[PDB]
Ligand binder design. Structure first.
Ligand SMILES: Nc1ncnc2c1ncn2[C@@H]1O[C@H](COP(=O)(O)OP(=O)(O)O)[C@@H](O)[C@H]1O
Ligand SMILES: Nc1ncnc2c1ncn2[C@@H]1O[C@H](COP(=O)(O)OP(=O)(O)O)[C@@H](O)[C@H]1O
Ligand SMILES: [Mg+2]
Ligand SMILES: [Mg+2]
Lengths: 359, 153, 606, 359, 152, 165
């Protein structure tokens, strides 16, 4: 059996090839005292330790903490020995080549994996939608990526990286929930706010009209029960928190919204292919799971795009783990057994074999 | 890349179709994964002869819940000249299962790159995208094309 | 003739880990050829010292192939440009130039009649093209591959056949001309590296990264056998080469061994263990006449010995990386040329016979900026690993020698009588006595770039970016600034005292060489004009009446000290590369090196 | 005294005739809220307003916005009344004749300048180097131009425009600095990266050889101090960032490098004059101020040039502002006072007077 | 253009040398007036026909300033021995930027006034003017075997 | 926002002090190099200080250091608005820019500090075209000639008022 590991900016999704969903989804954090706790242990260890993301915006910056997360993944989460299972790993768009080789070296030398493979997260989401040409709007935990792909080849000159993602929305919801009198400050209370965000938040088609609706009634108010039994109510904060995706000025940011970042990357491509990109905009990632986000994305992009063009936003129901699901389907194919990079091949061509075998 | 191997009959069929008896020339042909899902085989009874609306009888040949590859020898007459070029069609309906969509999409470059010389690729992810006669004209020559399949656009 | 090329010490093949290296042989069996950077090297197989270099590509040349007629060579680079050039004349005049596809070219094949060329690789919209050599018109189509094609070969006997090997673990078979796809062979399970037809054409073999070699019929493409049974090698085979009689096959693999196979009976004849380190992996091979070649990952060319498999006949060493420094020394009755590259390798060459080797042991780990020889027969070399090394030129072994570590990266080093070495660092001047740091001139008020010590070992001349040469004196264990500032026309790039110490020549970035008379108050003697780009190197002839300077204009001038109006113009001593360093073997022989990793000797006639 | 204004794609250089250096150098941007800020004022406000370039590739696109930059230049930067001083202006190569008439119209009607003159930027740089025939590679902020000039007459049929310039290099350094964990996304942080580019970046003679030696080089590592006191460290990115000038594939572009663009324009001229163009390649512009860019240009062009041809790359020490200094010297000459386009002559002829006097 | 006007002395000197002995001149240097308004003749910067003519002409050229020049080059081809006038624009890189701009921008005015001149030499450093190969090619393309008596 | 208005005398002085129009050499000497503003006795307008000004003619003849004597004009127990016409020089250009200095020492009465700070935004927005602002709250913050150099250009400034740093 092969292992599929999706190294997200904030959450690590791991499992076995052929399964419908990842077995383990844990935070991609390494906590050290204010000895070293990785994953959910760092979350459930009080505010006595500092938390650090080795992957924070899709790119591995600390390779010592990344090994700790991978060791935690195989032994504590997957409960398997990496030396007995091939591992399929996913890499962010615009990943430096040096980082790609370092990932290969760690698997074969630190974990002694018999076989290993690297895939691009964006192309796995696009392939899972039955498409080879299109633009993928992958909004995750710490980074949002708009990757235009034409005939299976991502266009590096047009890939836009946006630091706005679910992590900034969780902190924004904490800030605006204190307006109602709810004090969410500790690390334990941050996880509660994330649950509220993932259950009661939605994207409003018309933000200004929705704000008037909330202020003139209570039909939008919803109740959430805290772990200790207290029930809190949330009103206009349900659609205000994900509105920061389309209006980053709510967070004090300079960057454009996810709709404008998608439009900017499309306009950075050749005119011949812009029509196909406009009609093949695929959403992926956890932050794209808000209800009504496809309708809002369709309306906002239509305003920016020319009237003659056709805009289609694809939001598959499995888009939350579309990167992992695509990798699991690929790694479980009987024809994929020849696409792996063996240990024997590694110690004959070095880490540079990843550029020839993969990519 | 899924790792499936394109059948050698696909390359010969494309080679015969690329160059230009007439009653046996193929106008359309469908490709599918084999039963073991390790080969891009040619569908036995899903093809159109030149001697035999040719585009309508090809679209209705596409399955409603499974992905397919296709090779259409679309003919069109632009204002300046009349030309005929092969179009590679990747039929991948949304109603198709998740596994079928992923394997067909990840193995599309295995067959497309084996058919060197192809210049047009139509990615149809719904019936409205393949039935649409205007988008195929735009793929071929864009605004240059005025009539497709011998009929005005 | 004012100048004439005397000896060319060719560069080693440019090899990469995990990438097959293609070595071509001529139909006349005289010269085997390979590529390194932008240069195509035509080495004589009988005498590897004799060599010719063709440098006319603007990109990194990947493969070159002799025509079956032997009159032309087709070479392709990473930009997809193919050049066919004549080989009968030394000028190597270009015959035809083509761009079959916009991508890397991996292999080239000719037809028996030598009028059709098959070029394969990885293009934007195709992977191969076969065309007429004189018109570029397609005479076939290469289909059936969805990944980069690594190898191509054409059957040299009727009927003509074409076989390709690519990275989709498959080999395609073609028949022509015109060449049409016949079928794809999918026996291999990894990248197919080399596909070679036998010289008689009755069979062809495909080698791949899965350690297997398969023999097929050369006319029908039906499998005959698998070499070695279960496997041919314990690692990926990178190259195969049929024997001239078409009965044996020589294979080079990444398991650090090469083998000779009796194809007709499917038995291994000789196994050559090349080593046990990563650099001992074999990436290319050639079987020409009785010569069996094998190129290691270090770039060394090994002449395999059939009688003694463990020890090869010859191991052709040299530089596969750009050479930065060059010095000459006369030990005993033979003169040796020492050259250092940017990887730290130092290689000595015999001036007359051309035999070359490297110092034993472990030496420098980064670029060797400068090298010099003192009076005690020791090679003083400064390198980019912040170390100055003293190596005995008679032991030829790094182990047990003296290493001096510097806190600042050195840029130049000079030596004088009495065991005195002056090292110019980045904003620092370090004086070394008996391999020990005894003085420092940190914060000297300028930025030193070069240093020259007088042959009397008393005066030190240090140039700076400011364009002023400042003189020092080695009194005791300190350098004293004499308060003398020689003036140049621009940032000083090299300073060199005369061998008798009677003249100091200063060259700068203003394309000017200024000579100062040491005898008369260090005053300007003459100014030499003619360079049209920045001058990078300078050398003094042993007769103390001539000096030579090389610049970035790709031109070398030999200047007569008495008459500035007379000079010898060595135009393009190394084509497309400026001369990085130069030296004189004697009063009539000039040695020039460059970043093409080649060393050349020129006979200068005044 | 006369005024000299050099309208660039990214920077506006202005001053007085007879001065050694321009008095004012400010960004050529006009900001409007997400009432109107022009120049360094827009940079000091950042996210509140949206930045736009009227001159983006040497050619004016927004004539309304460029009027405000000119008004900012005369009153806020030069602090002089335009109606009291003649103004010498510089135009980009291949400037449309309609733009020339608009430029001469705005000066005489909107600003009431007494006298005016318009000069070609490329010929001013060539004249300042003591040359009349040659090819000028003007690599600026938003555009790179290779202008072959033959006895003072630029050859329009052989002028090639390359969009790769200093602006793209700043974005490239911004992207590859994030691989080290540094976050440079906001507009204010972009000028910080531009300062790093202008101080620590250099062109390597051989990129492959430099990459190998820089791995163990103790002098490659340089430290830069941010305005807030933080210290960032830059390594091999010093020579990787300007390498995109010669290898546009680093940016994802398919265009040729500056060395090939220069060679292409020479090959577009008559074989009679190509010998003089090869020996008179003059480098001008801010983007040509990298240490080692002249040596690299000579090496690269020699590869493309025929076998027996002299290649001379000219990089004067003042090439950064050669366009302005040439204009300032020309405008200060007493014999030049008869070549001004007088206000009276404008009324008689109209905007078409620029086509005859300024040539 | 800068607008500098060439004085009548240069025009009359060029006219006599253009239309064809010790009084006749072989080389002459044109400099800029102290007012920087006219191209005036330099006093001791002429080579007399009656008086290596090319070597001493280069010695007269200043090392830190720009000058104009008029050389009556005598190149002997195999077919015949032709002598033609050449225009030399001395503009060394060591010259101040003010001089280089004025001389370069006020050159087409001088050239148009000197009607009937074909060959031009644009020397920006000593190696461009000291060498004889570039001067020979301007006079005659691949036909010149010797220049100023001395063989090439 | 205290609502204090800017007097027309201050605006007229600023307009003359910003734009340099062609004038006789005897008229150039009448230009103002540094001028101090203050509140009216009724605290309703920002009037101009009568004798607290420096002329360009005084620079180089009577005033050896224009900045040093300008700081001496600032009271040490009251807040003031100042306009300094700094002529500095960077490594690439010789610049001459206007600097708005808000003097507000800690020893000043709280009534003066509050009104001057609250009404600063009103006067600054009327003086359009000024880029540099020096906020000085103690003598040490404004006496040092360097503190102007960091505000003006930062580390790029190599000369200030004709003298090296
Ligand atoms: N059902 C949901 N609805 C709204 N937001 C969600 C939902 N699920 C996850 N999110 C957010 O998605 C983020 C992580 O999702 P993911 O796509 O895996 O990012 P990454 O690839 O960086 O690991 C989390 O910050 C989470 O809060
Ligand atoms: N000293 C320098 N070294 C390297 N790059 C520089 C340097 N100075 C400027 N650059 C770049 O040059 C660009 C501006 O130069 P400029 O010639 O004025 O272009 P333009 O006139 O088109 O606006 C800027 O992008 C700047 O970053
Ligand atoms: Mg993700
Ligand atoms: Mg410019």
């Amino acid at each position: 059996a092969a292992l599929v590991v999706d190294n997200g900016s904030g959450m690590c999704k791991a499992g076995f090839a052929g399964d419908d969903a990842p077995r383990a989804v844990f935070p991609s954090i390494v906590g050290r005292p204010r000895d070293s706790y990785v994953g959910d242990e760092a979350q459930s260890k009080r505010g006595i330790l500092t938390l650090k993301y080795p992957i924070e915006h899709g790119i591995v910056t600390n390779w010592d903490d990344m090994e700790k997360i991978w060791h935690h993944t195989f032994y504590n989460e997957l409960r398997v020995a990496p030396e007995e299972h091939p591992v399929l790993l996913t890499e962010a768009p615009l990943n430096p080549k040096a980082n790609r080789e370092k990932m290969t070296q760690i698997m074969f030398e630190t974990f002694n994996t018999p076989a290993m493979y690297v895939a691009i997260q964006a192309v796995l989401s696009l392939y899972a939608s039955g498409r080879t040409t299109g633009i993928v709007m992958d909004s995750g935990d710490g980074v949002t990526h708009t990757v235009p792909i034409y005939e299976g080849y991502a266009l590096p000159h047009a890939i836009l990286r946006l630091d706005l993602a679910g992590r900034d929305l969780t902190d924004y919801l904490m800030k605006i929930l204190t307006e109602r009198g709810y004090s969410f400050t500790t690390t334990a209370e941050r996880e509660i706010v994330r649950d509220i965000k993932e259950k009661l938040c939605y994207v409003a088609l018309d933000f200004e009209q929705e704000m008037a609706t909330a202020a003139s009634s209570s039909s939008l108010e919803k109740s959430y029960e805290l772990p200790d039994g207290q029930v809190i109510t949330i009103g206009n904060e349900r659609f205000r928190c994900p509105e920061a995706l389309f209006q980053p000025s709510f967070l004090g940011m300079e960057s454009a919204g996810i709709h404008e970042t998608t439009f900017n990357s499309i306009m950075k491509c050749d005119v011949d292919i812009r029509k196909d990109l406009y009609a093949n905009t695929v959403l992926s990632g956890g932050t794209t799971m808000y209800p009504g986000i496809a309708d809002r994305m369709q309306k906002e992009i239509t305003a920016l795009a020319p009237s003659t063009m056709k805009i289609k936003i694809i939001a598959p129901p499995e888009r939350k783990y579309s990167v992992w699901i695509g990798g699991s389907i690929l790694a479980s194919l009987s024809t994929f057994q020849q696409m792996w990079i063996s240990k024997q091949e590694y110690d004959e061509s070095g880490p540079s074999i990843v550029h020839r075998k993969c990519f | 890349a899924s790792g499936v191997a394109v059948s050698d009959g696909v390359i010969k069929v494309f080679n015969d179709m690329k160059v230009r008896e007439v009653k046996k020339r193929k106008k359309a042909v469908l490709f599918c994964l084999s039963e073991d899902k390790k080969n891009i085989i040619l569908e036995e009874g899903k093809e159109i002869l030149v001697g035999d609306d040719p585009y309508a009888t090809f679209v209705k040949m596409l399955p409603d819940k499974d992905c397919r590859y296709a090779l259409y020898d679309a003919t069109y007459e632009t204002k300046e000249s009349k030309k005929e070029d092969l179009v590679f069609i990747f039929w991948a309906p949304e109603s198709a299962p998740l596994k079928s969509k992923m394997i067909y999409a990840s193995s599309k470059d295995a067959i497309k790159k084996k058919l060197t010389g192809i210049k047009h690729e139509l990615q149809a992810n719904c019936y409205e995208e393949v039935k649409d006669r205007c988008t195929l004209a735009e793929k071929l020559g864009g605004s240059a094309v005025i009539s497709l399949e011998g009929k005005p656009l | 003739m004012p100048y004439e090329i005397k000896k060319v010490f060719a560069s080693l093949p440019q090899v990469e880990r995990g990438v097959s290296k293609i070595i071509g042989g001529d139909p006349k069996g005289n010269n085997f050829l390979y590529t390194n950077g932008k240069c195509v090297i035509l080495r004589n197989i009988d005498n590897p010292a004799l060599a010719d270099i063709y440098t006319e590509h603007a990109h990194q040349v990947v493969v070159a192939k002799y025509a079956p007629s032997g009159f032309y060579i087709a070479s392709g680079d990473v930009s997809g440009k193919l050049r066919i050039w004549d080989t009968t004349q030394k000028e190597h005049l270009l015959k035809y130039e083509y761009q079959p596809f916009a991508g890397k070219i991996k292999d080239i094949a000719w037809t028996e009649d030598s009028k059709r060329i098959a070029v394969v690789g990885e293009g934007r919209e195709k992977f191969g093209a076969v065309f007429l050599w004189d018109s570029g018109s397609s005479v076939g189509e290469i289909t059936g591959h969805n990944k980069v094609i690594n190898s191509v070969d054409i059957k040299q006997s009727r009927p003509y056949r074409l076989a390709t090997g690519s990275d989709d673990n498959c080999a395609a078979f073609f028949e022509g001309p015109p060449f049409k796809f016949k079928f794809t062979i999918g026996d291999h399970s990894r990248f197919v590296n080399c596909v070679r037809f036998s010289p008689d054409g009755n069979r062809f073999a495909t080698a791949s990264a899965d350690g297997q070699i398969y023999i097929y019929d050369g006319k029908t493409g039906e499998k005959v056998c698998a070499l070695g049974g279960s496997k041919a090698h314990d690692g990926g085979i990178y190259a195969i080469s049929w024997s001239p009689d078409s009965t044996h096959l020589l294979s080079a693999s990444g398991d650090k061994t090469s083998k000779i196979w009796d194809v007709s009976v499917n038995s291994v004849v000789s196994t050559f263990p090349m080593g046990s380190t990563v650099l001992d992996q074999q990436l290319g091979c050639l079987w020409q006449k009785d010569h069996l070649l094998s190129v290691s990952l270090s770039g060394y060319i090994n002449y395999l010995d059939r009688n003694n498999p463990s020890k090869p006949l010859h191991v052709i060493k040299g530089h596969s990386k750009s050479i930065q420094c060059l010095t000459v020394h006369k030990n005993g009755g033979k003169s040796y040329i020492y050259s250092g590259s940017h990887d730290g390798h130092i290689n000595y060459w015999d001036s007359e016979t051309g035999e070359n080797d490297s110092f034993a042991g472990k030496g420098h780990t980064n670029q060797v900026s400068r090298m010099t020889v003192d009076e005690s027969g020791q090679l003083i070399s400064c390198s980019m690993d912040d170390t100055v090394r003293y190596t005995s030129l008679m032991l030829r072994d790094y182990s047990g020698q003296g290493v001096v570590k510097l806190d600042v990266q050195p840029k130049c080093v000079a030596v004088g009588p009495g065991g005195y070495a002056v090292v110019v660092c980045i904003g620092q001047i370090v004086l070394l006595k008996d391999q020990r740091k005894c003085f420092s001139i940190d914060n000297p008020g300028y930025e030193p770039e070069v240093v020259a010590v007088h042959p009397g070992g008393d005066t030190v001349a240090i140039g700076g970016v400011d364009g002023n040469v400042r003189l020092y004196s080695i009194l005791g264990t300190t350098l004293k600034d004499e308060g003398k500032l020689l003036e140049a026309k621009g940032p000083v790039t090299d300073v060199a005292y005369s061998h008798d110490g009677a003249f100091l020549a200063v060259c700068d970035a203003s394309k000017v060489v200024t000579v100062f008379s040491v005898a008369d108050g260090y005053s300007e003697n003459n100014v030499f004009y003619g360079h049209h780009a920045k001058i990078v190197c300078l050398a003094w002839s042993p007769d103390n009446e001539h000096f030579a300077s090389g610049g970035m204009d790709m031109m070398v001038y030999v200047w007569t000290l008495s008459d500035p109006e007379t000079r010898v113009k060595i135009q393009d001593a190394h084509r497309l590369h400026h001369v990085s360093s130069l030296a004189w073997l004697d009063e009539h022989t000039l040695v020039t090196t460059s970043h093409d990793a080649s060393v050349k000797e020129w006979t200068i006639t005044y």
